[PDB]
Amino acid sequence: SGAIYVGNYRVVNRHLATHNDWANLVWEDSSRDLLVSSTTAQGCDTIARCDCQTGVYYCSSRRKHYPVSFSKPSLIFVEASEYYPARYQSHLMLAVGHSEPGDCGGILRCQHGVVGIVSTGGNGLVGFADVRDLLWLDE
Ligand SMILES: CSc1cccc(Br)c1CC(=O)N1CCC[C@H](C(N)=O)C1
Numbered sequence: 497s498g499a500i501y502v503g504n505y506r507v508v509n510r511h512l513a514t515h516n517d518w519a520n521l522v523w524e525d526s527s528r529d530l531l532v533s534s535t536t537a538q539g540c541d542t543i544a545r546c547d548c549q550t551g552v553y554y555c556s557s558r559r560k561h562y563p564v565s566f567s568k569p570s571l572i573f574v575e576a577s578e579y580y581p582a583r584y585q586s587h588l589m590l591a592v593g594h595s596e597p598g599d600c601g602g603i604l605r606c607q608h609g610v611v612g613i614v615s616t617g618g619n620g621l622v623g624f625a626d627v628r629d630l631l632w633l634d635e
């Protein structure tokens with residue numbers, strides 16, 4: 497679990513979104529596993545606007561932060577789950593690192609701010625759902 501709080505916005509994994517998230521829905525995309533919802537209290541997170549391919553992410557299953565090299569946002573095939581049928585998820589960045597089901601929501605940061613959140617994983621890999629293209633979070 498985890499979320500990005502930037503201004504009057506909350507960015508969460510679409511599969512982990514609450515009833516309140518849907519009641520104050522701003523934007524959602526199944527293919528990216530993202531859901532943004534309006535909050536009534538001011539956020540704080542700086543959103544990175546960059547092309548960094550290295551960073552640090554919080555691993556909930558180890559209570560530790562890990563430095564990683566990650567790929568550029570792309571369409572990577574993600575297998576069937578209780579939340580989605582087998583499909584291509586876009587804006588995904590894979591990395592070599594530890595990941596497990598309860599890790600979705602962990603923030604990936606670089607020297608410029610928040611890059612994205614943990615979305616996929618498995619097999620000694622971790623997948624991040626990029627948010628750097630969503631310029632309207634800061635405006
Ligand atoms: C039990 S499979 C597994 C294994 C290691 C790490 C992780 Br995180 C998972 C779970 C996983 O990748 N997903 C399930 C939830 C929705 C995700 C999506 N964005 O489509 C995909």
Ligand SMILES: [Zn+2]
Nearest residue numbers: 546548606608
């Ligand atoms: Zn950066």
